[PDB]
Amino acid sequence: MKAANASSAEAYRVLSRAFRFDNEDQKLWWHSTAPMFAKMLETANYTTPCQYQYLITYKECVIPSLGCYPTNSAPRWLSILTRYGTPFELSLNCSNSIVRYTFEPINQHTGTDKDPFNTHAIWESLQHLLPLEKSIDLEWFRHFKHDLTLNSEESAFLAHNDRLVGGTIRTQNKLALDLKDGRFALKTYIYPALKAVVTGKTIHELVFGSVRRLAVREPRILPPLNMLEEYIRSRGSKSTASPRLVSCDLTSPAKSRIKIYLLEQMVSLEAMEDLWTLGGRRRDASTLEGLSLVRELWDLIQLSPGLKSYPAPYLPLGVIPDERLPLMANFTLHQNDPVPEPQVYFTTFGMNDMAVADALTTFFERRGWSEMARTYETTLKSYYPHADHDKLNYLHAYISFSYRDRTPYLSVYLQSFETGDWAVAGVY
Amino acid sequence: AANASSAEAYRVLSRAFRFDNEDQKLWWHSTAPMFAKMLETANYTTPCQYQYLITYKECVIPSLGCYPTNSAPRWLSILTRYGTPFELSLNCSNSIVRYTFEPINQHTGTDKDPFNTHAIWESLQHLLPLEKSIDLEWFRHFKHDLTLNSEESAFLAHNDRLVGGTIRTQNKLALDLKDGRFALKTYIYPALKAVVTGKTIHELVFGSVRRLAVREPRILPPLNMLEEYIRSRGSKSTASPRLVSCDLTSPAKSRIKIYLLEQMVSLEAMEDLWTLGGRRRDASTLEGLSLVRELWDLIQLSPGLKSYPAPYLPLGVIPDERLPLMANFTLHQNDPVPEPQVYFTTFGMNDMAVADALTTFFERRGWSEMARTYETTLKSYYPHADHDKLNYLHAYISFSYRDRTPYLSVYLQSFETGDW
Ligand SMILES: N[C@@H](Cc1c[nH]c2ccccc12)C(=O)O
Ligand SMILES: N[C@@H](Cc1c[nH]c2ccccc12)C(=O)O
Ligand SMILES: CC(C)=CCSP(=O)(O)OP(=O)(O)O
Ligand SMILES: CC(C)=CCSP(=O)(O)OP(=O)(O)O
């Protein structure tokens, strides 16, 4: 019985017939990622015009910022975005059927001596996106980018001394788009790790210092920021959780979230709960309903528990993972709520994909997400229709969970590379 | 322009050798150019070069498992950060080439031997007839006490939640190649023993040496001192027992070396290991301490507490990590004080910088040849590498100060060398 194949997605096929590509890399990027992208839009019930709209913006504004087509045979920028270092990833917000994607902007100067840590390329991507969406605001972006990524002089200093960082993934910042309502919302992610190296500060001081400075002009972010920092400090100097990155929405400050992400090396339900409740600071009924769903997801997904080291910096393409990763959580500073809001990440990368898709579909059924439950596995398989589906262990990078307005919110972050007809065209 | 693949013994043996599978052939071409070039530059005689390379090819290569690639199942050895089961070291102070490997056979990693506790017996069987001075008395003792038996293996295999991402290596062998003969050593990793028995690695190792000391009372004093030193570091010590080695030679000639992993990478940490927390303060200890400090100053290890790294790295992935220090303490039967050897763990550091540090140290000791040829030879092992960007060749530099002689070895990535 012939099976569904994302390369048959009509919007993918039509756009392929329409599009001008002026280099090979972009063309490869399009054919590598668009089948899954178009198929995901379709199955998430985006109207046909919206499928076209989003795939065109992606092709015209984003693909030219994904650098050369990734192979193991030629140099490429390795992005912190995925374990394979590819600078593009789709996520399906399953609870709302919203498609999002994240990319790390890369341009000609990325990784050359003019931008050895890729701290400049993001401006050029913003330049292409800004005219498309009136609501895009860069005020907070500029602030965090200035405080938390390498400037030019820090870059040249670290490039000369790059013995200090060896094989460190260099990503400074990434952008993501939430696709909704014929519009998009823009988000950024900023990785202060190398900024920490060069300033001799810790990522925590950088992140919290920058947010405090911002709270001078935006006092409403201060109360959740204070609670967050008190929670972190309370975990002590041997905490298994450490600040890793910060995100904010690129819209007006009044509407923008700041999200502070902790890497949590202890994979256990207890560690997850502690993050969820900020060590028992959140005891409200809403938190507790959310908590029952965290526990349910924990029990379905069956992550391998225990302390997890940092993984190998990246996996070459084609390499089957043999690893399990730290959890993650972010804490959102809402301006209308004094208590930071958590979102937790079940880091499934390396786990059996069909098992994980089964855990997901069970969770979907239980939530009454009838259609999600019905279509999820079939659709997932269609993204990689030539794979040995039962042996895949690298599609599901993360499952997110938060509980917003008494509403379960879940996204899956999926390997997004060499999809559809591409493939034909020990210790765990 | 030097290239290890031009090494004559490697070229000539490559014309001579029968290989019965691809894996052994790949292993030979992957490792032999560096191994032959290393023997050449360490001034081994032509006959020794051939002799060591042949025994290596015939007795050892068939025990290295499938050729390591990222795209097929292989045994992941603790021996290297890439899980490859072969590594050459050069004892720079004596020009002695040594190598370590983890025996692997057909049953390794299967339900007949899921933790690779049996393969070693087969490798020993191949080596024994070549070296009369091999003795297994202490080896049998330690392996018995410190590695999984068949029963514990099946239990652990059925309960591998208890293992998780842990590298499973039970035991390794090393050959010191001197004077047309070789001395055999073993390294025994009691980590999984500890899981199944409920013992700490400390209890296992010290318990095992104490049971041995019944038959060999002379090892007891340095063992008591080592243990008193370790106990003195308390339950939150950043140093803990990791492995044990002994020579596979007659007990009267055999050293037992107990290894501590030291997560605190600092000069202070290294000095404390060197002097066993101030218990060693004789002139010879202090002379050695000077050299330790000088090495410290030259090598410039990234200081601070180092976490356990990823269990292993995929081949081809350059590291971004810095690792704990190591030290071993030797129990000599004629000396009541355990003798330390410390390890500067350079893995992940810029290799040319480390090579420059080493060259300077060689100069200062007047190892004038060592200093002249080291960088050149090192480059010739990986002649197509972007040498200045390499940060994974030097795994470790060892140092001890033996009968008032500086003793130094470098442990080097030994994989895909020469014209690979
Ligand atoms: N790979 C990222 C985590 C991540 C996965 N998907 C993402 C999408 C957007 C931002 C971050 C992510 C990290 O290690 O930190
Ligand atoms: N890889 C070993 C240390 C080591 C490096 N080279 C060696 C050679 C022989 C024995 C041990 C080693 C460990 O992690 O414990
Ligand atoms: C998967 C990880 C670690 C980060 C991305 S979180 P995100 O911005 O996608 O979160 P939301 O869009 O707010 O759900
Ligand atoms: C490099 C590490 C951690 C261990 C091996 S020590 P070794 O047996 O090679 O030391 P010697 O041969 O006694 O100098």
Coordinates of C-alpha atoms and ligand atoms in Angstrom, one line a residue, chain B residues 77-81 87-89 98-101 172-174 185-187 189 242-243 245 259 261 323 326 343 395-396 411-412, ligand 2:
Chain B
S77 CA 36.0 2.0 24.4
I78 CA 36.8 4.3 27.3
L79 CA 40.4 4.4 25.9
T80 CA 39.7 7.5 23.8
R81 CA 37.2 10.3 23.6
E87 CA 46.1 4.5 21.3
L88 CA 49.8 5.0 21.0
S89 CA 51.8 6.8 23.7
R98 CA 53.8 1.9 24.0
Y99 CA 50.3 1.2 22.9
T100 CA 47.0 0.5 24.6
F101 CA 44.1 -1.3 23.1
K172 CA 42.5 -3.0 28.4
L173 CA 46.0 -4.1 27.7
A174 CA 49.1 -2.1 26.9
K185 CA 50.1 -4.0 31.5
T186 CA 46.4 -4.2 32.1
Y187 CA 43.9 -1.4 33.1
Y189 CA 37.7 -0.3 35.2
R242 CA 38.6 5.4 38.6
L243 CA 40.8 2.4 37.6
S245 CA 46.6 -1.0 36.4
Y259 CA 44.2 5.9 39.5
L261 CA 40.2 11.1 38.6
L323 CA 38.6 17.2 31.1
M326 CA 44.2 12.1 36.5
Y343 CA 48.3 13.5 34.1
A395 CA 44.9 13.3 25.0
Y396 CA 47.3 13.4 28.1
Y411 CA 49.2 10.0 24.7
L412 CA 48.2 10.7 21.2
Ligands
LIG2 N1 40.8 7.0 28.5 C1 41.1 6.6 29.9 C2 42.5 7.3 30.3 C3 43.5 6.8 29.3 C4 44.0 7.5 28.2 N2 45.0 6.8 27.6 C5 45.2 5.6 28.3 C6 46.0 4.5 28.0 C7 46.0 3.5 28.9 C8 45.1 3.4 30.0 C9 44.2 4.5 30.2 C10 44.2 5.6 29.4 C11 40.1 7.0 30.9 O1 39.2 7.8 30.6 O2 40.1 6.5 32.1

